[PDB]
Amino acid sequence: KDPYFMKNHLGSYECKLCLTLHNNEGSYLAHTQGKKHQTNLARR
Amino acid sequence: AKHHPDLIFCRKQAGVAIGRLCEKCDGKCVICDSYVRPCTLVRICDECNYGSYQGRCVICGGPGVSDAYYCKECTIQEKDRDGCPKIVNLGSSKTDLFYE
Amino acid sequence: RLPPEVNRILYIRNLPYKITAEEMYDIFGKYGPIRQIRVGNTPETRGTAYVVYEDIFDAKNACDHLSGFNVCNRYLVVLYYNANRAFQKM
Amino acid sequence: ERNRPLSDEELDAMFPEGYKVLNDQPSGNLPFLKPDDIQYFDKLLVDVDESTLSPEEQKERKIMKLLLKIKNGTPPMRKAALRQITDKAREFGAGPLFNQILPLLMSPTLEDQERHLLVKVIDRILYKLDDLVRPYVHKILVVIEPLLIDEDYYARVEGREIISNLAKAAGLATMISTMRPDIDNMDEYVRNTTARAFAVVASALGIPSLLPFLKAVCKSKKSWQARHTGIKIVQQIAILMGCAILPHLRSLVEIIEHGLVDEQQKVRTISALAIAALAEAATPYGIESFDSVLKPLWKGIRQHRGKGLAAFLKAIGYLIPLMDAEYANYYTREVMLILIREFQSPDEEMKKIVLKVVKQCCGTDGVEANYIKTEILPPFFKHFWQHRMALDRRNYRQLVDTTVELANKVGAAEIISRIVDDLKDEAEQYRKMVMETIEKIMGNLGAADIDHKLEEQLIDGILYAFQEQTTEDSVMLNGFGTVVNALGKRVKPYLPQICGTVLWRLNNKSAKVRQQAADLISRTAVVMKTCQEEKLMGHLGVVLYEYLGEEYPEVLGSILGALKAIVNVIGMHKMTPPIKDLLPRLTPILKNRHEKVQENCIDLVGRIADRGAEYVSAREWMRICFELLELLKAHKKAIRRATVNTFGYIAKAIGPHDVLATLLNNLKVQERQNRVCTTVAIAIVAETCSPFTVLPALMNEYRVPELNVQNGVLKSLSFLFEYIGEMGKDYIYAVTPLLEDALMDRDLVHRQTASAVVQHMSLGVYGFGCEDSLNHLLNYVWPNVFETSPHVIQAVMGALEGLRVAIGPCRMLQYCLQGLFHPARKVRDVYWKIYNSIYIGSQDALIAHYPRIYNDDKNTYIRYELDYIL
Amino acid sequence: PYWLYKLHGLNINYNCEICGNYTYRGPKAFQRHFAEWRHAHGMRCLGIPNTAHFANVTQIEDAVSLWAKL
Amino acid sequence: EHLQSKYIGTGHADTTKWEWLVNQHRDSYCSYMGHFDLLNYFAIAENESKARVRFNLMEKMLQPCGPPA
RNA sequence: GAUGUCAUACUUAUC
RNA sequence: CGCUUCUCGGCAAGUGUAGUAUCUGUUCUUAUCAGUUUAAUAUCUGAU
């Protein structure tokens, strides 16, 4: 249950915590693990 | 054409020689490359149609079948009053597929 | 001069199940020597087969002369072998 | 690599389950290097280890490393390496790039694809290295010299384009200074390549730019090799530029008249070849400029014999149509005996020159037909109609052209009576040349001169040539079709004798014989309706309806083409293979993966939907419309243009309510050439039927949360507006909020599609009083001109060119106002480009829409002529 | 972060002589604070009305000359 | 580059105001010499005929704004 | 916000 | 006894070219002067 990943009006994924875009579903699950996502999780 | 950005036209003095089109590009425009609402024929130059280059395609370059003509969007926007729309040089188009 | 999409193996889809090995060898061996031919024996893979030839030019001439061949009452299609498309069920 | 034998384990590992059998790696992820190419990439096998031991030239090793991605790497890796080499061509420099590209292209173990990639990399690095390759001009000219004399036409065209780019980048002084020691070289092939490069540079840089240098090279008397190279360069410039050396014909003739007078026969032959090229280039032209060239040419042709006399005869035959009627009549009366005496020449070049001059010697008045049939045509038939002339292409095409000229001049019957005996020979090339000559005589002259004693023999020879074909050439079928079209009603006692041979050829062990019989039946399908033959066509259609079980797809496509020709030559509702028993019979035939057979099936389905739509029970069309979406995404560019017309015909026949839902459902496929084809089919269905009934449904596909479906709906709306044109004035208010909401999206592709739709609505509704919606679209498209994508910039330029012609040039000048003197250069360049486009679109309309400018201290800019009033 | 302060034009000293020679760490920040309450209260002491002509005015003498010229 | 050399009066990103004003004055003079209505208005405004107005418009084509700067 | 390697998706009736 | 019609229940569309929007692995708290360039930043080049 991720409260930051949402669906846009173009059939994509949007992370509002880091304000990032992902086209397919396989890139949204791989964007949670990283440096910027951990920095946005630690800063908020 | 509008698909290949490296394609350049002749832009020379258009004479009385009417342009021709091949069977693979019959009906399509020279500039807009559209096959809807033809309005005016294409006028070739003197150097683009001389000897063995007479009756050839302006876009592709093979044997001509039908007559070349521009669409209504080129006649209304004054695009047919320019030079001869003859493709002389072919860069990065139909060259690497023959060798592969 | 040959495209890189062509290969020595060719896939056939929507094949008749009552076809024997001799008819498949006669239909595949018309354009050259066929090295191997494997027909599907599964309910999830019925109607498909893989014919691998010995020569690449003979395999290209066979694949160019098998797309839409006249067979029993099905629409069989011949295509080139792909590594990513054959393992789509896994 | 692709033809290497594999073991059983490699064959078993490449097959899924459920089938019954009836250091050497440089720096990691680099591709495999050749064992003979370990010299240019020898510094890539070791590690770089950049730590205070990395000069600038090691970065040039990276320019080699991307070359390792360019020669034998992946095509995405090759595209990335080409992008990295084109984007960093100025930072890397032309020096080390040329020093790394010169031994790579000069390797003796290269290939055609590697040489093409090297030529593409040299052409792509030629635009960013302008005015910097002047020391490296000779190193590129020595590598581009054998490319112009290659056997392939594409490699020669690429070498000519590279030479033109080098001449445009290096100017005119550097190309003249580099090729100046390359004229007196000892090698003849290198001198000919340098002459061809100088001719290409003179064609790309202008004739008077290199005319005094060529005149000084031709007028210098030091050696015969320099004069021969200059004459060869002049001949190559005359043969390359056809009608471009026509104002400069006198300056070339004054330099060519100085030759052909020395003791060297090679310089005289080169001067005669240059004079023949100048006569054949500008024809009919140069009559007064060639008066001083015929007097030594006639003396050289009458006083001596050999290759120079043949070159002088070829020059006289090339300049003979370029003279007056009396001059050509006087020249033809004194050169026919020399042409008849040279008919028994053992040399092939002199025989080819005589065959080329015989076509131009008899092309006008002066030469009678009786003397040409008595003393010219029997030696031309006894000396040139041999078996060795059909081997070479240049010796066969010129002979066929000479035979066509002799048939057009003297007569077609006298050539058909002598060319029919070689149609039943044992050689395939001579029979094909005779069939091509008979087809040319039937197309140019006709068959009115052929009597009844020769037409049956010609038909028997054509049948013997068609029945004994071993190759896959379509010359014999085209010749038989041309002979049938020239006969017409004279082939009435010939249709059963052709039908009995066409039906017997359909049942054979071979596969190409049935395809050839079907192609001959399709080529002779129009000759049966004009000859009152309806039972034979009805029998051939009933035979072709059952002969669709040919296992060869090339025979099945030819049978489908013959069935389509029989349905086009006869009535659609009066065919013994009717449409009620053919359209369900072709429904599994449309699912073929072939190229020509699927296109023929799509054309037959479109013809059956356009002419026989009342022969179905309104159920097979809805099932075939779902199979029409699978007929696209083919690399043929023929079935995708007919499938949209077939879908439009099905929507016009069965009502645009069922195909529109399928076209909207097939728009979400995420594949190339599958979404634009469905959008074009939906636009054709909206243009054929009423556009209002597809108006809310096109507003529904934008309601689904998808980018590809919305882009396809926008492309379909733009194509429907472009197909409508003047009928889009009533559908502008329904598309205006969709175009307003599509231009405010974050995606650039949707903004480009909205700009294209606005450009189509501007070009279609121009001059109808709809300038308010055009201004509302321009007010949203004006912030879209600052994009960085070239496609979005081209769409914005097309929208601006549409709004300048629809809303007027005054609104375009007001929208582009206060942007020409802008401080930011990135917006000022776009504003200057928009102002140049508005001036090219309408230059006279910018006078009344020009703003008022105050006068300065030293200059005055106030228009005092238009400010005064009476 | 230093990259967000170097890309957005921050950490750049700017002097404003209108509001008592105050300091600003950005051109866009100074342009946003020009049409604000502090710059209006600083300009109201000199007698200049809050208009659009004195947006890029920094010195007091130039603003007084622009107010006297209109 | 080539667009300014082929069609005069187009302009570029480094175009000054004096050259653009001279091009606009030349375009206005060409439109006045081409259209008969502007020539008739210029002949009715002054006391000269159409030929004198055409000669005055042709003589003012060379540097219509003055010396450049 | 930029850089350089990898992946995904999109456009020009491209073949 | 045989033939025909209607209704009900169960039973693998690929390759090559042109451009583009995103995260994923990372870098600059160097304090002045002069120059190229940038609308203004940023970046580069020489002297403490």
PDB file of N, CA, C and O in Angstrom, chain B residues 36 44 54 57 69 76 88:
ATOM      1  N   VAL B  36      -5.024  12.989 -50.764  1.00  0.00           N
ATOM      2  CA  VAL B  36      -6.390  13.494 -50.713  1.00  0.00           C
ATOM      3  C   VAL B  36      -6.430  14.885 -51.329  1.00  0.00           C
ATOM      4  O   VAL B  36      -5.541  15.709 -51.084  1.00  0.00           O
ATOM      5  N   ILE B  44       8.302  20.149 -63.363  1.00  0.00           N
ATOM      6  CA  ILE B  44       9.693  19.766 -63.179  1.00  0.00           C
ATOM      7  C   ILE B  44      10.596  20.797 -63.844  1.00  0.00           C
ATOM      8  O   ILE B  44      10.156  21.635 -64.638  1.00  0.00           O
ATOM      9  N   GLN B  54      13.747  11.497 -68.076  1.00  0.00           N
ATOM     10  CA  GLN B  54      12.397  11.876 -68.462  1.00  0.00           C
ATOM     11  C   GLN B  54      11.417  10.756 -68.131  1.00  0.00           C
ATOM     12  O   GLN B  54      11.692   9.578 -68.374  1.00  0.00           O
ATOM     13  N   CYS B  57      10.135   9.097 -61.527  1.00  0.00           N
ATOM     14  CA  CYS B  57       9.495   9.539 -60.298  1.00  0.00           C
ATOM     15  C   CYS B  57      10.305  10.650 -59.642  1.00  0.00           C
ATOM     16  O   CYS B  57      11.539  10.622 -59.644  1.00  0.00           O
ATOM     17  N   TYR B  69       1.075  15.299 -58.884  1.00  0.00           N
ATOM     18  CA  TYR B  69       0.230  16.450 -58.610  1.00  0.00           C
ATOM     19  C   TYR B  69       0.290  16.776 -57.124  1.00  0.00           C
ATOM     20  O   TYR B  69       0.504  15.894 -56.289  1.00  0.00           O
ATOM     21  N   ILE B  76      -3.230  26.052 -51.665  1.00  0.00           N
ATOM     22  CA  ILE B  76      -3.826  27.151 -50.911  1.00  0.00           C
ATOM     23  C   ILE B  76      -2.768  27.924 -50.133  1.00  0.00           C
ATOM     24  O   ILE B  76      -2.908  29.133 -49.925  1.00  0.00           O
ATOM     25  N   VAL B  88      16.932  15.017 -55.553  1.00  0.00           N
ATOM     26  CA  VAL B  88      18.168  14.727 -56.270  1.00  0.00           C
ATOM     27  C   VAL B  88      19.037  13.806 -55.425  1.00  0.00           C
ATOM     28  O   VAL B  88      19.382  12.698 -55.847  1.00  0.00           O
TER      29      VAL B  88
END
